[PDB]
């Protein structure tokens, strides 16, 4: 069946770097787009960063550009998000989506992760 | 940055309850519009595409609309298992990526509503002492269980060092939260009075208190 | 009334918790016992009967035991989905009937523990001339998010009247909680002073104010 | 499957009655002690009351006996609970529970419902 399980998250200091990974199952990743979803503590739904299924179109949420960096590996049926000179407003819930289509074109996400906690101190 | 929605609504088992999203010219306009839903402590769930399509496993009183810069989530029959938590959500040309609605919450009523008690306390004279001025505004006996909170220092709005506690059921069922507001023993004598004003189903109440 | 449980405890994943629950004679001496487990907003479920069998659908790291007059939970290899509240229960003699222990709270911890700052804080001068006189005892940036609060009225402990809300996780990943105690004004100059003590697994701090 | 259903959860005055039901399907109710277990707002477990599959035996707990009332129909498949003289400190949510055994001797309570809610005022 269809699964996506995320790892990475941990307590970090202010102005520190961290990578998180997505792994998924159950479907084959090189036709669908991906992208990353977080959530702070009490509050809502905030976009970050999404990609095509072939890598070539990226784009980010106002908060992060510059600072994070979305990349996959369709072989290793891997997702990844870098993260840099993070701040307090990072500390959240990111979660691992992904696309009905091909293309980072639309806000429709079929499947969601269960997630991981960053926490920035 | 965001879609408009209403934080709160209700109604009762077997009523009709909608929900809205308004947009611009920029998201909802041009591109259609999904909706998600979120129980407490769990990941969100796709409940609509593509303006008005439901996935399989919804039921079929869930319907979506879309009109002009604006769209809507309407759920006939309600049940106790749709308390939950609605986004929208719409892909947006200026952003270059996805925008979301802010959330609305919506309760399924088994007692009298009720609006809240407010109490705004100043700061105590042990933690000013300490170097700490920390002022606690005091939200009880509201239903249902969801609230807005803004504070105001003299009549500027201030967002740094806000914190709401997620409102909790007391033992008569009612509902209750707190907001606290981290200031230095400078800030609060900098200004002639600060103001906690809490919005319960689109009503205001608002408190007011100034160093002695 | 109760059987004796630890309020809370934790553990790092893939760690060995215990949890304890003690009775008397007229209990878990003559009579064996069972654990139930609860997730928040759910009912509770039965993990363990006749003092060491597992019902069928529960994982084998899950093993109970009964020595005299007190029992024993083990989990070993803690897993995220172990998050939750567990309660010991047996016959008893001399209630003729069920008695149930008080519940103890289990984390997996993700992030490092954490001592609750507290303050006190006397009744507001506007709710005063309400003919009204709260007290509010705040508790914040402690991890894991679970506490026990007890009141004194000089130096009696008072259990009329006093609410604490169920903690709730803020913007930098620690909880929250606020308790608030209803006097009258009388009540209030009636007694030299009044005291909020806090318990965080197994420590305490106590706060003190008075009539100025 | 096993499944039980309670229905009667109203908010009332203070001093009233209040008559709670519990349905039981997917089994043999006559063979079973029933009992009702609540829950006041970010408290324990209390133990209500208790009968065996002949209601011939019945116990209560401390706070409800002489108030509360505990009886079955064994043709209907539902167990009942009758509450007098409510007091704010019935405030909570009601459970029914289903034992292996057909006596109530025990704490051994395999089924539970989902609940109803009580208010008093
Ligand atoms: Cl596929
Ligand atoms: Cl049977
Ligand atoms: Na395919
Ligand atoms: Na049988």
């Known amino acids: 069946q269809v699964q996506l399980v995320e790892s990475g998250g941990a307590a970090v200091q202010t102005g520190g770097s961290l990578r998180l990974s997505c792994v998924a199952s159950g479907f084959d990743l090189s036709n669908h787009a991906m992208a990353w979803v977080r959530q702070s503590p009490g509050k809502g739904l905030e976009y970050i960063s999404g990609?095509?299924?072939?890598?070539?179109?990226?784009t980010y949420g106002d908060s992060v550009k510059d600072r994070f960096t979305i990349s996959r590996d369709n072989a290793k049926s891997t997702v990844y998000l870098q993260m840099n000179r993070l701040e307090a407003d990072d500390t959240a819930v990111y979660y691992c989506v992904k696309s009905s289509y091909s293309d980072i074109v639309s806000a429709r996400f079929d499947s969601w992760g269960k997630g991981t906690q960053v926490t920035v101190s | 940055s965001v879609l408009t929605q209403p934080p709160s609504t209700s109604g009762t088992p077997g009523q009709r309850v909608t929900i809205s999203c308004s947009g611009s010219?920029?998201?909802?306009?041009?591109?259609?519009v999904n909706w998600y839903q979120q129980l407490p402590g769990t990941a969100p769930k796709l409940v609509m595409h593509?303006?008005?399509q439901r996935p399989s496993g919804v039921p079929d009183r869930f319907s979506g609309s879309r009109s002009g810069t604006s769209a809507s989530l309407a759920i006939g029959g309600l049940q106790s298992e749709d308390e939950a938590d609605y986004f929208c959500?719409?892909?947006?040309?200026?952003?270059?990526?996805?925008?979301f609605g802010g959330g609305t919450k919506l309760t399924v009523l088994g007692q009298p509503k009720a609006a809240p008690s407010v109490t705004l306390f100043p700061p105590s004279s042990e933690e000013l002492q300490a170097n700490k001025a920390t002022l606690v505004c005091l939200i009880s006996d509201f239903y249902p269980g969801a609230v807005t909170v803004a504070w105001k220092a003299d009549s500027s709005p201030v967002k740094a060092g806000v914190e709401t506690t997620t409102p909790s059921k007391q033992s008569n069922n009612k509902y209750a939260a707190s907001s606290y507001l981290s200031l230095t023993p400078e800030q609060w004598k900098s200004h002639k009075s600060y103001s906690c004003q809490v919005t319960h189903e689109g009503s205001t109440v608002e408190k007011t208190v100034a160093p002695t | 009334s109760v059987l004796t449980q630890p309020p809370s405890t934790s553990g790092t994943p893939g760690q060995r918790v215990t949890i304890s629950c003690?009775?008397?004679?007229?209990?878990?001496?003559?009579?064996?016992?069972?654990?139930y487990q609860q997730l928040p907003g759910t009912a509770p479920k039965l993990?363990?009967?006749?003092?060491?069998?597992?019902?069928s659908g529960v994982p084998d790291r899950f093993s109970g035991s009964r020595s005299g007059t007190s029992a024993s939970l083990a989990i070993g290899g803690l897993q995220s989905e172990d998050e939750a509240d567990?309660?010991?229960?047996?016959?008893?003699?001399?209630?003729?009937?069920?008695?149930?222990?008080?519940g103890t709270k289990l984390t997996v911890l993700g992030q490092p523990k954490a001592a609750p700052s507290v303050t006190l804080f006397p009744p507001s001068s506007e709710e005063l001339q309400a003919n009204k006189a709260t007290l509010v005892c705040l508790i914040s940036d402690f991890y894991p998010g679970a506490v026990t609060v007890a009141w004194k009225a000089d130096s009696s402990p008072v259990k009329a009247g006093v609410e604490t809300t169920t903690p709730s996780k803020q913007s930098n990943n620690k909880y929250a909680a606020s308790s608030y105690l209803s006097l009258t004004p009388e009540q209030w100059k009636s007694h030299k002073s009044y005291s909020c003590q806090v318990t965080h697994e197994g420590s305490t701090v106590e706060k003190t104010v008075a009539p100025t | 499957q096993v499944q039980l259903v309670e229905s009667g959860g109203a908010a009332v005055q203070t001093g009233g009655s209040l008559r709670l039901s519990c349905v039981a399907s997917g089994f043999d109710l006559s063979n079973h002690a029933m009992a009702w277990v609540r829950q006041s707002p970010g408290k324990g477990l209390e133990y209500?009351?208790?009968?065996?599959?002949?209601?011939?035996?019945?116990?209560?707990?401390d706070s409800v006996k002489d108030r509360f009332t505990i009886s079955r129909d064994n043709a209907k498949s539902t167990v009942y609970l009758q509450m007098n003289r409510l007091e704010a400190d019935d405030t909570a949510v009601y459970y029914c529970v289903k034992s292996s055994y057909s006596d109530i001797v025990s704490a051994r309570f395999d089924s539970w419902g989902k609940g109803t809610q009580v208010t008093v005022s």
């Open positions: 010219s920029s998201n909802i306009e041009t591109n259609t």
């Open positions: 593509t303006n008005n």
């Open positions: 959500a719409a892909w947006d040309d200026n952003l270059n990526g996805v925008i």
């Open positions: 990609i095509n299924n072939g890598g070539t179109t990226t």
